[PDB]
């Protein structure tokens, strides 16, 4: 499935996406990208639109 982030960061905003065989996979994959990228936020997911949000 494809997953998709949305990034709404102080200095970073936009959208990227992962592909992934399940939620949690992409959420490591979503989880290690913010952090490699210096986002530390609050996440929501939404499994109708499989869609993760991040903000600062």
Same mark, same amino acid.
């Given at each position: 499935? %494809?997953?998709?982030?949305?990034? +709404?960061?102080?200095?970073?905003?936009? &959208? $990227? $996406?992962?592909?992934?065989?399940?939620? &949690?996979?992409? &959420? !490591?994959?979503?989880? %290690?990208?913010? +952090?490699?990228?210096? @986002?530390?936020? @609050?996440?929501?997911?939404?499994?109708? $639109? !499989?869609?993760?949000? @991040?903000? &600062?």
């Amino acid at each position: 499935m %494809q997953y998709k982030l949305v990034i +709404n960061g102080k200095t970073l905003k936009g &959208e $990227t $996406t992962t592909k992934a065989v399940d939620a &949690e996979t992409a &959420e !490591k994959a979503f989880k %290690q990208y913010a +952090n490699d990228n210096g @986002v530390d936020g @609050v996440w929501t997911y939404d499994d109708a $639109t !499989k869609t993760f949000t @991040v903000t &600062e």
